[PDB]
User: Fold Calbindin from Rattus norvegicus.
Amino acid sequence: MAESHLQSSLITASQFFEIWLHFDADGSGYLEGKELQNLIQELLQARKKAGLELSPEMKTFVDQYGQRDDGKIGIVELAHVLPTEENFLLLFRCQQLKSCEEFMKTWRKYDTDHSGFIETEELKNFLKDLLEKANKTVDDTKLAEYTDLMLKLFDSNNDGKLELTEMARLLPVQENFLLKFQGIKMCGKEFNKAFELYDQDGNGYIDENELDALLKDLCEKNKQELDINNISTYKKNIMALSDGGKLYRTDLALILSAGDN
Assistant:
């Protein structure tokens, strides 16, 4: 299949997601390291076989990732490795364009007062906002393939909505608190209760401070994913989805919800 779509056309997100899924054996929602040496090995092949020289990015993705055995890649890394959508990717990397933790700040803006996951009509609208960011307005071919990959590659329960791990899979794992935040999954139930704990005034609202008060649990819970150094930062990022410096938990829960859906 790769061999066909890899160097076939500018393939959409589910396709490139499939081609990459081909080697994405551990289905960890990310290409592995060896799988990368195994995938990237198929890339240079898709080129040699499909009669296309390997693009500096594929040949380099291979030169770069051909040794990322102790490394992993998200949807965005592979999204643009293959010529799936040089245009749709503009929003694809919109997560990594300036910041992994910052873009997410914008992800919740349209999320209807930030429900914790975008909607079908909202996310479908969200991609548009991506268009607003790319300053190009990625055509239907760019944003649709995207709109769908958002709710599909992350389909919590298949409602049509969007959670973070999709945006987190297409976002920059490099500094994203999410890739660690997923494993950081306390539990939507502990989220609700801890949050309530952070809700010291009993007002139903958590501010960017409680956020670090949230992380304090987290770092002590997993210094492997939550460092008390970046914890204040982990409080900062969830904050990115909060409301006017005061967070409505519907924004944080998504950061570390086990996947309550």
The longest strand covers residues 206-207.
